[PDB]
Amino acid sequence: QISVRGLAGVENVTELKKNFNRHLHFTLVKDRNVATPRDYYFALAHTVRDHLVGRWIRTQQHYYEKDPKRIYYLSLEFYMGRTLQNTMVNLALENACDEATYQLGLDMEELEEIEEDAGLGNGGLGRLAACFLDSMATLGLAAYGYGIRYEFGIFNQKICGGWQMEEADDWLRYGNPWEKARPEFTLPVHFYGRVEHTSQGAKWVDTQVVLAMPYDTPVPGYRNNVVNTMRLWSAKAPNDFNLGYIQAVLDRNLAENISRVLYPNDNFFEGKELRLKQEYFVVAATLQDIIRRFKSSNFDAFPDKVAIQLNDTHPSLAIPELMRVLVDLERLDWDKAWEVTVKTCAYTNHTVLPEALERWPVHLLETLLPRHLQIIYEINQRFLNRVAAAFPGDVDRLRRMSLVEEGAVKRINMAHLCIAGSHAVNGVARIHSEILKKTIFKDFYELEPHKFQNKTNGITPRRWLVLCNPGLAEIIAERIGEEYISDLDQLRKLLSYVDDEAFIRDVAKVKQENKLKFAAYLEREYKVHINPNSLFDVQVKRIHEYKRQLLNCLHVITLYNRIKKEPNKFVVPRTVMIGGKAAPGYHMAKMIIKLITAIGDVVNHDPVVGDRLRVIFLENYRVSLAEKVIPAADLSEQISTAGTEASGTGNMKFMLNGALTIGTMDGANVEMAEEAGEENFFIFGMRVEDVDRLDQRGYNAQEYYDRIPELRQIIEQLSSGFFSPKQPDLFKDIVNMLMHHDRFKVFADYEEYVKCQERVSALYKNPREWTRMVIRNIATSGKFSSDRTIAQYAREIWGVEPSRQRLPA
Amino acid sequence: QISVRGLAGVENVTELKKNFNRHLHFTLVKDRNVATPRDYYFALAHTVRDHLVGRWIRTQQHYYEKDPKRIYYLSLEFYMGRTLQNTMVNLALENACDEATYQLGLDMEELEEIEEDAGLGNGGLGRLAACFLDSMATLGLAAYGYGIRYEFGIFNQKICGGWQMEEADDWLRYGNPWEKARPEFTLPVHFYGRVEHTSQGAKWVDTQVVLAMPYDTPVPGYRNNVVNTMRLWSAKAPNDFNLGYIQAVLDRNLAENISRVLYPNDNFFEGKELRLKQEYFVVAATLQDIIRRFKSSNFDAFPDKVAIQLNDTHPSLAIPELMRVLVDLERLDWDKAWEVTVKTCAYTNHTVLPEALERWPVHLLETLLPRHLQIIYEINQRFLNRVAAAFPGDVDRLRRMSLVEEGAVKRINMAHLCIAGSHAVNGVARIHSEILKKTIFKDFYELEPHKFQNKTNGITPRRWLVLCNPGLAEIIAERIGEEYISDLDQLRKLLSYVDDEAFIRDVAKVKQENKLKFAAYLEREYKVHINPNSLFDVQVKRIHEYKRQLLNCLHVITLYNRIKKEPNKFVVPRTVMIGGKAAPGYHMAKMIIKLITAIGDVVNHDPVVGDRLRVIFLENYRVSLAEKVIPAADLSEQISTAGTEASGTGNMKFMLNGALTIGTMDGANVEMAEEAGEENFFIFGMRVEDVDRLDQRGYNAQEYYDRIPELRQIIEQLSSGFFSPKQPDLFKDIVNMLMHHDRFKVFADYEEYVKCQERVSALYKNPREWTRMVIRNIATSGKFSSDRTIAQYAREIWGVEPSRQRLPA
Ligand SMILES: CCc1ccc([C@H](C)CC(=O)N[C@@H]2O[C@H](CO)[C@@H](O)[C@H](O)[C@H]2O)cc1
Ligand SMILES: CCc1ccc([C@H](C)CC(=O)N[C@@H]2O[C@H](CO)[C@@H](O)[C@H](O)[C@H]2O)cc1
C-alpha cells in the first residue's frame, strides 16, 4: 500500500502464505477451525523468524572468517519492546506480510497487538541500549549485547481508585519465538567462599556455583543482511545442588532467583544482596564467553580484538573480574593485566543525582566476592599513589578520589572504580559531559583529562519513525527518497519545503490522522472520550521529582482556574496527557500519580469546562504505548530542572514525529534548540547558572507563594481538600514538600512556564505557522539518530570503522 | 536391514533427509560445521514429530465428530522412558530413518542414546500407566492420560563408596520436543478458604488460587494412525499473586512448587501437605477439563460419555470433587449426583502392605480442603447407614468399614472412600484380587460383591519386544508373520517349533548376541568386565524388603563359600546382576545396596573364584536400562514373599525376552506358571497358605540359623566384618533385622531357594534343553500383553468396544 514498506511480489506472497500454513499445522499443532488470533500471531512470527536465520548464521560465520574487533555492550537492561514489526521493517517484508495475511483473511495490525513487550528495562537507559543494538547492526559492527534474561520485566501498572497498583509482567507465559536457548554454552559462576594464598598466587576456593545458561536473540540491521546477537543469561542450579530430599530440590529456587526479576528502582540506589548477585552474574558469565571467543581465533592483542562498554556502573565488576582472570588464572603480572584492562574497558555515565550512584557496603563484597574486594583495594592503593605523585601534599584530594569511602559503613564508589579502570569516560549530552568535568568528576578530569568525552544520545529512526509513523515516513520519502532512513541528516533537505503549500497540508494531515487513530484507541481499550481537535499536550516518562510532572500539574490547575474565573472567554482547547510508572517504594511519586488522577476527576466532569480541557493519566506507559502516543502529540513536555536530566531521549522521539517542544535548557534539549534554532523551540526557565545562584542564596519557596496570587490559590486548593473532598488532608505531604523541602525548585520556574505556555497556545491558533515550525524541527532532527551516536563511539572510543555495505543474501 | 522395522522407500528416505536438514537450519539454527550429536538428535526428533501431527489433529477431530465414550486415566505417575524409537516403531519409520541418517553420515542408535528418559514415575505403577496408554491407542479407544508435569522426575542414582547418592533429574534442561504447551487452556485450582452456607447451598470462599497449565504429549497406536493425548498439568501463580515488591515476585515459587518434584517413596505413605496439594491439583484441573469437553457436545448421560479410572487412591479426591461440582455448582440433588459419580468412577488397587495405604489426617483436609471434608463426612454417614441396614447390630463392622478412622489422630481411609464411590474395584492379578476379597476388603465384598473384579496386568509388546529386542522379533516374524505384534496370543504357534533345530539355534544365537552387546555396554560406560559365557542372573526392581534382594544375597554368598571350600570343583559360571533405586528415607534399603556392593568387592577380586562368579550392582536402573538388560538375561529373579507382590510386570518382560524364571507363587508368577506349565518354571518356597500357618505359630528365625550350617556361616561372616574389614559392625542392623524382626521370612525360604538354584545350574549345562524350555515360555507369554488387559477393562468396566481398524492417513 505505501512505498517505504517494500515490495509485495507474487512469488514472495505465495511463499509466505505456504510457510504460515505450515507453521500453523506443524509448529502450533492447530487447524483453522480451532485457531485463535494468538495462534495466528505465532504462525506469522515463526514465518518471519525463518527469514532471519540464514542471515544470522552467515553473519556469525562472516565474523569468524574475518576476525574483526568485537564490541561487547554490557547492560543490566535492554528495553526491547515488540519484535515482529521491527523485524519486518528491517528485512523489507512488511507489505509482503500485509498482503499474505490479507489473502488468508487476517488483519496483520491486529496480530501485531498480541505480542508482549520485552520489558527488560525501566526507561531511558534500557531503551538506549535497545536503540544502540539496532544502530550497531545497521552500521555493520561485530557487536554483542549481553544482559540478563529476567523472567519478570518491568511491572504492569494498573490504576485503582487513582492509585498505582503493580502486577507481575509474566512476559514468557506463551513462549518467546525470537529467542534460541543455548544450554550447550552454559558456564559456571562462583559466589561466597574464601581466598587462600599459595606460593603460586591467590586461589578463590569453597565457593557456591550457579550456572549461567545463555539465550540468543537476533538483532537485524536495516536492509543490510547483518544479523547480530543479544545474549541474555538465565540462572540454573547445578544438579548436585544441596545434594529432606524434597526440600533440597525445592531449594534450587534460591540459585535461580538471580534471574527472576528486574529491579524497578531507577535513579535511586538500594544496596541489596540479590542485585549485587545479578551484577556479578552477568559480568562473570560474559567475560568467560569473551575470553573463550578470543582464544578460538597472548593477551597483548586482547584490546585490539575486544572492546567492553559498561552501561553505567551496573557492570563495573567487569574491571576487577578481568583482573582476577588475567592475574589469578592466566598468570599475567599485575602491571600487564592492568594495561590490558584499561585499554579494553570504557564507561558511560547516565546521571548526576548523588542518590543514584552505586556505593556498595564493603561487608557485602567481603562476604560475596572476597577476591574482588582484595583486587579493588590493590587498584585503589596504586591509583592513589599516582594521585599523590601528581598533587603532592593534597591530602583532601586523596580522600575525595579514593575508591573506598570512609564513614559509618565503608563503601566502594563504583563510579570511581570505573574511571580508574577505563580508557574513556563519557556523558550522554554536551551539557552533562561538561557538568561531569566541572563538578562531580572534577578531580579525575584534572588527573587524566584525555579520558573524558561526550557522546550525545540518539534514537533509532527505524522504530521511532518508519515503524511507528509510516504516514510521516511516506510523505517525506515522496519528496526526498528513502536514503534518509539510514542517513538521517538528509532530513535537512526538507527545509526547501517549508513554504510548499502541498507539504504543509500533508504534514498537518498526517498529524491529524495520527490523533484520530489515538483518540479511537483511547475509547476502545480504556472507555475515555477526547476531543481530537484539541492541542495534544503530552508528558510521558518515569515519574520522578526531578522531571517535574508537578510543574505540569500546577499549569493544568492554573488553566482550570482561569476558565472558572472567565468561563465565556475563548481558550485554545487542550488534552493534557501524563503517563509513566513510579518505582514501587517511592512514596512521593505514588502521590503525584494520585494527584494527576484527582485533578482529572474534577476537571473532566465540570460542565463549565466542557471539552476545552481534559486531563488523562495514560496507564501502563511502555515502549508499545510510546509508539502510539508520540506520533499523535502536538506538544512535548521536557521540563526537568536545569542540570538534572542527563540527556533525555523521549525528547528526540517527539521532535522526529512532528511535535513542538516546551522545555528547559537541560540535557539534550540544549542541542535540539541549537539544531532547530531557538526561535523554533519554546524555551523557558532557569539555566544551570541560575539554579547555582539560587542555591548559594538559599531557595525559599514562601517568597514565590507570597508574590504570585495564582500560585497561592492552587496551594490553598490542594491544602483545603478541593481535589480530595472526602479526604481533605490527602495531599499535605505534597504541599509540605513544595513549601519547605523542594530540591527541584518547582515554584521558581512557575511564572515563566505559564507565560511560555500562553505563547504555545497563540501559535496553535495559526495552523499554518504551527506546521511550518514543525517542519523546521523535523528537518533538523538528524543529529539525534543513534546511527550518529554509534559512529562516534566506534571511531572515538572502540577504534573500529562503521560500514553501510550489504552482506550477500 | 530387518523386516519388522518397515520399508525404506526412495521417496521416504529423500523426504526425511530434506526435513532433517530443514530442522537443523531453521529449528536448531546450526549448520553441519558446529553441530554436535545432540543437535542431530533434536533434528531427527523434530522430523519424526512432524509425521505425528497430521494424525494427532485428525484423531482428535474424529473423536469430536463421532462423540464416543471417553476414557480418562488419572495417575500421579507416567513412567514413559524415551519417545523417539517408540514413535518410529509405531509409525513404521524405523528403517527409513536408519537409512536417511546413514546417508547423512550419522549412526541413529547413537542419536537415540542422547534422549533423556521421561522418568515421571517410581516403578511398576508408573510403567503400567505407560504400557496402558500405548495399548489404549493401539485398540482405538478415545483415551486420555492425565497427570502432573513434574520438573524433576525420579532421581538419578549414583553409587559412591558403595552407597546410593541421589541427584536431581533435570530432564527438561535441553527442552522436550514431544510436548506442546497449551497455555490457552489454563484452569484455576482452589486451596484453603472456608465454607459458607447460604439459603442457596454451600459456597467455598476466600480461597487461594493456583493455575493449572496443560502440556499435551502425543501417544501413537501401533500402525493404526490413531494418536491419543497425555495431558500433564504444570502449576503457575496468578499475576496478582501476593500483589517487598521483589519478595512478592520471588514468592510465586511457593505456588509453583506443586509441580516441581515427584515423591520417590513407593509402598510407604507419608502424610505430607505438598503431596496432598499435588493430588488435588491433578484432580481439580482434570475434572474441569472433563466437564468442559462433555458440555461441548443433562448429567444423566454423563456416565454414558465419561469413564474415570483411578490409578490407586492417589487421585481419590476425584470422588468428592465430582460431588462438589455437581451439588454446589450444577445444583443437582445429592442422590442424583452420587448415582452419576459411582457410575463414572472405578478404582484399581495395587498393594496390600498396610503402610502403603493412604490415610490422610483430618486436620490437613480441614485446613486445605474444607468443603471436601464435609462431603466425605456425608458420604461416610450415608454409606454406614446402608451397612447398618444390611448387617443390623454388627457394630464392629461399622467401625471397620468407616471412611473415618478413630484414634490419636483421626484419619480418612482413602481406599474405603474409593470402594464406596466406584462401581468397580479391581486387583492386578488373580491371587491379589482374591486376597482383596478374603482379607483387607472382606467387609466390602460381603456388602457389594458385584463391585469386585480382577484385571491381570500386562506389558506392551511394542516397547518390550519389537523395540528392545529386534533380533528376537525378527526370527519370530520369519516363522509366523508380523500379526503377533498386536495379537500376542499368536505366539502359541511357536510351540510347533520346539523341536525345530534351526529355530533352537536362532533363539540361542539371539540371546548370545544380546549378551555380548550388554557385556560391551558395561565396559564402555562403566569400566566393568564380565564373562559373556556365564549365566546372566538378574534381579532388577525397586529395593524393598518384601522383594527380598536379601534372599538373593544369601544365595550369592552361599555360592562363594562353596567355591572357597572346593575350589577345584566345576560350577556353572554366573554373572549375578542386581539393580534398583531405594527411596531416599528408607534406611534398610540403603543398607541392602551397600551390602550388595560389599559382596562384589570381596567376590570380584578373589583370585580363586576367577571368572566363575561375578556380582555387579547395576547403577541407575530405569526404563532405558531395562530395555538393555532384560533382553540379555538368562534367569529372572522374582522372589517376593508369597502374598506381597500384587502382580509384578518385570516378570512378564523377562518371559517375553527369553529368560527362564526362578520365583515364588506370588502375584502374576502364578498365572505365568499356569500358562507355560509348572515344569517349565523354577518354582520354590512357601505358598500364601504356608506363610499364614507360620504367622499363626510365630516366625522364629533362630530355628533356621540353628539347623542350617551354611546359613549360620553367612550370618557369622556378616556379623564379624568379613564383608566390611575396616568397619566390622557395619551390617549389624541387617543381621539384627534378619534374626529378630523379619516381616518377610527370608530364612524360611532359604533352603528351598538354594536347591532350586542348583536345578537351574543343571539345566543351563544342557544348552539345547535350556533353549527348548525358553521357547515354551516365549510361546505362552501372550496372555501378558497389555492389549489383553485393556480389552478386559474396556468390556468389563468402561463399557466400550475395542477396535483394530486403521484411521485413514
Ligand atoms: C542504582 C539504580 C539505578 C538504576 C538505573 C539508573 C539509570 C542510570 C537511570 C536512567 O535511566 N538514566 C537515564 O539515562 C538515559 C540514557 O542515557 C538519559 O537520556 C536520561 O537523561 C537519564 O535519566 C540509575 C540508577
Ligand atoms: C503412598 C506411597 C505410594 C506410592 C506408590 C505406590 C504404588 C502403588 C507402588 C507400586 O508401584 N505398586 C506396584 O504396582 C504394580 C502395577 O500394578 C504391580 O505390578 C506391583 O506388584 C506393585 O508393587 C504405593 C504407595
List the beta bridge partners of residue B163: B160
The 3-class SS string of B385-405 reads HHHHHHCCCCHHHHHHHCCEE
Q: Report the distance separating Cα A438 and Cα A433, nearest Å.
A: 9
List the beta bridge partners of residue B181: B215
Backbone φ and ψ for B366, nearest 5 degrees, come out as -55, -45
> Both A577 and A437 in a single domain?
no
d(CA B29, nearest CA chain A) in Å: 7
B655 closest CA partner among B786, B459, B486, B470: B459
**DSSP three-state, residue B372:** helix
Q: Where are the alpha helices (DSSP H) in A221-361?
A: 245-250, 252-256, 273-295, 302-305, 318-324, 334-344
Which residue puts its alpha carbon closest to atom 25 of ligand 1?
Answer: A267
Q: Report the distance separating Cα A78 and Cα A232, nearest Å.
A: 10
Q: Report the distance separating Cα A536 and Cα A525, nearest Å.
A: 19
- C-alpha A124 – ligand 1 centre gap (Å): 6
Which B residues, 271 through 290, put their C-beta within 8 Å of a C-beta on chain A?
A: 272, 274
Task: For A405-436, give the DSSP string.
Answer: EPSSS-EEEHHHHHHHT-SEEEESSHHHHHHI
Residues with Cβ within 8 Å of B254's Cβ and at least 6 positions away in sequence, in order, are B237
> Both A361 and A402 in a single domain?
yes
Rg of chain B over Cα atoms, rounded to whole angstroms, equals 27
> Both A7 and A67 in a single domain?
yes
Q: Does B240 touch chain A (CB under 8 A)?
A: yes
Q: Which of B50, B274, B584 sits opposite A245 (nearest CB)?
A: B584
Instruction: Give CA torsion, residues A56, A58, A64, A66, to 10 deg.
Output: -120
The 3-class SS string of B148-161 reads ECCCECCCEEEEEC
- Quick one: which atom of ligand 2 is closest to the CA of B312? 8
**A28 close to A43: Cβ distance less than 8 angstroms:** yes
Element (H, E) at B654: helix B650-656
For residue A772, give the amino acid letter: R
| Beta carbons of B173 and A155 less than 8 Å apart | no
**C-alpha to C-alpha distances, A65 to A54, A70, A236, A704, B559, nearest whole angstrom:** 17, 13, 33, 67, 66
| Beta carbons of B57 and A31 less than 8 Å apart | yes
| Beta carbons of B166 and A260 less than 8 Å apart | no
Q: Report the distance separating Cα A191 and Cα A627, nearest Å.
A: 41
DSSP state of B570: -
Compute the C-alpha angle B229/B427/B122, nearest 5°.
Answer: 55
**In the block, residue with C-alpha cell 526531578:** A546
A440: which 3 cell numbers?
A: 562531580
Q: Does B37 touch chain A (CB under 8 A)?
A: no
| Beta carbons of A245 and B264 less than 8 Å apart | yes
Residues with Cβ within 8 Å of A795's Cβ and at least 6 positions away in sequence, in order, are A801, A802
Pocket flag, ligand 2, residue B358 (CB < 6 Å):
yes
List the beta bridge partners of residue A217: A230
Start-to-end CA distance of chain B, whole Å, equals 25
**B174 close to B191: Cβ distance less than 8 angstroms:** no
**DSSP three-state, residue B330:** coil
A279: which 3 cell numbers?
A: 551484577
> Both A438 and A585 in a single domain?
no
Backbone φ and ψ for A658, nearest 5 degrees, come out as 90, 30
Q: Report the distance separating Cα A404 and Cα A516, nearest Å.
A: 57
**C-alpha to C-alpha distances, B787 to A331, B651, B804, nearest whole angstrom:** 67, 17, 11
Q: Report the distance separating Cα A710 and Cα A716, nearest Å.
A: 10
**In the block, residue with C-alpha cell 559360571:** B573
Q: Is the dihedral of CA B378, B383, B384, B389 positive or negative?
A: positive
Residues with Cβ within 8 Å of A632's Cβ and at least 6 positions away in sequence, in order, are A511, A514, A515, A517, A518, A519, A536, A538
> Both B157 and B296 in a single domain?
yes
- Quick one: which atom of ligand 1 is closest to the CA of A667? 21
Residues with CB under 6 A from ligand 1: A 123-125, 128, 265-269, 312, 350-351, 356, 358, 428, 457, 645-649, 667
Which residue puts its alpha carbon closest to atom 14 of ligand 2?
Answer: B125
Pocket flag, ligand 2, residue B349 (CB < 6 Å):
no
For residue A650, give the amino acid letter: G
Q: Which of A155, A240, A250 sits opposite B167 (nearest CB)?
A: A240
**C-alpha to C-alpha distances, B596 to A427, B533, B578, B669, B727, nearest whole angstrom:** 70, 22, 8, 25, 16
**A592 close to A550: Cβ distance less than 8 angstroms:** yes
Q: Are strands B424-427 and B635-638 parallel, antiparallel or unpaired?
A: unpaired
Is A653 tagged catalytic? yes
Q: Where are the alpha helices (DSSP H) in B23-76?
A: 37-66
Q: Does B7 touch chain A (CB under 8 A)?
A: no
A70: which 3 cell numbers?
A: 568485537
Q: Does A245 touch chain B (CB under 8 A)?
A: yes
Q: Are strands B411-413 and B359-361 parallel, antiparallel or unpaired?
A: antiparallel
CA B421 to chain centroid, in Å, comes to: 25
Element (H, E) at A213: strand A208-220
Q: Report the distance separating Cα B384 and Cα A174, nearest Å.
A: 49
Q: Report the distance separating Cα B40 and Cα B776, nearest Å.
A: 42
Active-site amino acid positions of B: 350, 541-542, 547, 649, 653
Q: Report the distance separating Cα B504 and Cα B768, nearest Å.
A: 7
- C-alpha A451 – ligand 1 centre gap (Å): 21
Q: Is the dihedral of CA B229, B631, B510, B48 positive or negative?
A: positive
Task: For A737-801, give the DSSP string.
Answer: HHHH--TT-TGGGHHHHHHHHHHHHHHHTSHHHHHHHHHHHHHT-GGGBHHHHHHHHIIIII---
**In the block, residue with C-alpha cell 569516560:** A425
Annotated binding-site ranges of B for AMP: 31, 64, 292-297
Q: Are strands A345-348 and A424-427 parallel, antiparallel or unpaired?
A: parallel
Q: Report the distance separating Cα A54 and Cα B110, nearest Å.
A: 28
For residue B41, give the amino acid letter: Y
List the beta bridge partners of residue B152: B261
Q: In residues, how long is chain A?
A: 809
Pocket flag, ligand 2, residue B672 (CB < 6 Å):
no
Q: Report the distance separating Cα B358 and Cα B528, nearest Å.
A: 42
Q: Report the distance separating Cα A425 and Cα A448, nearest Å.
A: 10
**B336 close to B388: Cβ distance less than 8 angstroms:** no
List the beta bridge partners of residue B361: B411
**A155 close to A169: Cβ distance less than 8 angstroms:** yes
B348 closest CA partner among B426, B417, B416: B426
Residues with Cβ within 8 Å of B153's Cβ and at least 6 positions away in sequence, in order, are B117, B118, B119, B120, B121, B169, B171, B262
Between A and B, how many residue pairs show a Cβ–Cβ distance under 8 A? 101
| Ligand lying closest to the C-alpha of residue B76 | 2
CATH number at residue A557: 3.40.50.2000
A582 closest CA partner among A16, A163, A273, A2: A163
A156 vs B contacts (CB less than 8 Å):
239
Compute the C-alpha angle B225/B230/B233, nearest 5°.
Answer: 155
Residues with Cβ within 8 Å of A151's Cβ and at least 6 positions away in sequence, in order, are A170, A172, A259, A260, A261
Q: For the beta carbon of residue A629, count every other beta carbon within 10 angstroms.
A: 22
Residues with Cβ within 8 Å of A503's Cβ and at least 6 positions away in sequence, in order, are A475, A479, A494, A497, A775
Pocket flag, ligand 2, residue B234 (CB < 6 Å):
no
Task: For A572-625, give the DSSP string.
Answer: --EEEEEE----TT-HHHHHHHHHHHHHHHHHTT-TTTTTSEEEEEETT--HHH
Q: After which residues is chain A broken (C to N over 2.5 A)?
A: 243, 297
Q: Does A50 touch chain B (CB under 8 A)?
A: yes
| Beta carbons of A261 and B249 less than 8 Å apart | yes
> Both B800 and B759 in a single domain?
no
| Beta carbons of A249 and B152 less than 8 Å apart | yes
Is A350 tagged catalytic? yes
- C-alpha A351 – ligand 1 centre gap (Å): 6
Is A31 annotated in a binding site? The answer is yes
Task: Tell me whether residue B450 is exposed, middle or buried, using C-beta atoms within 10 angstroms of its C-beta: 0 to 12, 13 to 18, 19 or more.
Answer: exposed
A730 closest CA partner among A603, A604, A619, A592: A592
Q: Report the distance separating Cα B281 and Cα B147, nearest Å.
A: 9
- C-alpha B586 – ligand 2 centre gap (Å): 16
- C-alpha B81 – ligand 2 centre gap (Å): 18
| Beta carbons of A257 and B274 less than 8 Å apart | no
Q: Is the dihedral of CA B78, B81, B84, B85 positive or negative?
A: negative
> Both B465 and B450 in a single domain?
no
Q: Report the distance separating Cα B800 and Cα B142, nearest Å.
A: 10
> Both A495 and A406 in a single domain?
no
Q: Report the distance separating Cα B398 and Cα B401, nearest Å.
A: 5
Compute the C-alpha angle B407/B413/B417, nearest 5°.
Answer: 140
Q: Are strands B359-361 and B118-120 parallel, antiparallel or unpaired?
A: unpaired
**DSSP three-state, residue A212:** strand
Q: Report the distance separating Cα A207 and Cα A195, nearest Å.
A: 10
Number of domains observed in the structure of chain A: 2
**A263 close to A585: Cβ distance less than 8 angstroms:** no
> Both A406 and A533 in a single domain?
no
| Beta carbons of B175 and A181 less than 8 Å apart | yes
**In the block, residue with C-alpha cell 509508539:** A627
Pocket flag, ligand 2, residue B265 (CB < 6 Å):
yes
Compute the C-alpha angle A42/A44/A47, nearest 5°.
Answer: 110
- C-alpha B542 – ligand 2 centre gap (Å): 10
List the beta bridge partners of residue B165: B158
Rg of chain A over Cα atoms, rounded to whole angstroms, equals 27
**DSSP three-state, residue B345:** strand
List the single best residue of A246, A268, A273 to mutate versus B (max B Cβ within 10 A): A246
Task: For B162-216, give the DSSP string.
Answer: TEEEEE---TTTT--TT-EE-GGG-EEEEES-EEEEETTEEEEES-EEEEEEEEE
B601: which 3 cell numbers?
A: 568387592
Q: In residues, how long is chain B?
A: 809
Domain interval for residue B135: 1-458+786-809
| Ligand lying closest to the C-alpha of residue B272 | 2
> Both B792 and B711 in a single domain?
no
Q: For the beta carbon of residue B709, count every other beta carbon within 10 angstroms.
A: 8
| Beta carbons of A585 and B245 less than 8 Å apart | yes
Resolution rounded to one decimal, in angstroms: 1.9
Residues with Cβ within 8 Å of A472's Cβ and at least 6 positions away in sequence, in order, are A465, A507, A510, A631, A657, A658, A778
For residue B337, give the amino acid letter: A
Compute the C-alpha angle A454/A456/A462, nearest 5°.
Answer: 150
Q: Where are the alpha helices (DSSP H) in B657-766?
A: 669-676, 688-697, 701-707, 709-720, 732-740, 750-764
**In the block, residue with C-alpha cell 562403566:** B526
- C-alpha B141 – ligand 2 centre gap (Å): 25
**B441 close to B452: Cβ distance less than 8 angstroms:** yes
List the beta bridge partners of residue A189: A210
- Quick one: which atom of ligand 2 is closest to the CA of B428? 17
**B463 close to B86: Cβ distance less than 8 angstroms:** yes
Instruction: Give CA torsion, residues A216, A218, A219, A221, to 10 deg.
Output: 150
Q: Which conformational region is residue A305 in: left (phi greater than 0), alpha (psi within -120 to 50 degrees), or beta?
A: alpha
- C-alpha A350 – ligand 1 centre gap (Å): 5
B343: which 3 cell numbers?
A: 457410575
Which residue puts its alpha carbon closest to atom 16 of ligand 2?
Answer: B125
| Ligand lying closest to the C-alpha of residue A313 | 1
**A219 close to A227: Cβ distance less than 8 angstroms:** yes
B551: which 3 cell numbers?
A: 534372599
> Both B346 and B371 in a single domain?
yes
Which B residues, 174 through 213, put their C-beta within 8 Å of a C-beta on chain A?
A: 174-175, 180-181, 183-184
B77 closest CA partner among B1, B172, B165, B149: B149
Backbone φ and ψ for B578, nearest 5 degrees, come out as -130, 130
| Beta carbons of B53 and A29 less than 8 Å apart | yes
d(CA A577, nearest CA chain B) in Å: 27
Task: For B216-254, give the DSSP string.
Answer: EEEEE-SSS--EEEEEEEEEE--TTTT--HHHHHHTHHH
Q: Does B767 touch chain A (CB under 8 A)?
A: no
Task: For B625-647, give the DSSP string.
Answer: HHHHHGGG-SEEEE-PPTT--S-
> Both A215 and A178 in a single domain?
yes
Q: Does A254 touch chain B (CB under 8 A)?
A: no
Task: Report the b/e string of A179-206 with b at 16+ CB within 10 A.
Answer: bbbeeeebbebbbebeeeeeeeebebee
**DSSP three-state, residue B363:** helix
Q: For the beta carbon of residue A513, count every other beta carbon within 10 angstroms.
A: 14
**B533 close to B572: Cβ distance less than 8 angstroms:** no
B695: which 3 cell numbers?
A: 504367622
CA atoms within 13 A on the CB side of B17: 15
| Beta carbons of A243 and B167 less than 8 Å apart | yes
Q: Report the distance separating Cα A611 and Cα A633, nearest Å.
A: 18
**DSSP three-state, residue B57:** helix
Q: Report the distance separating Cα A109 and Cα B453, nearest Å.
A: 60
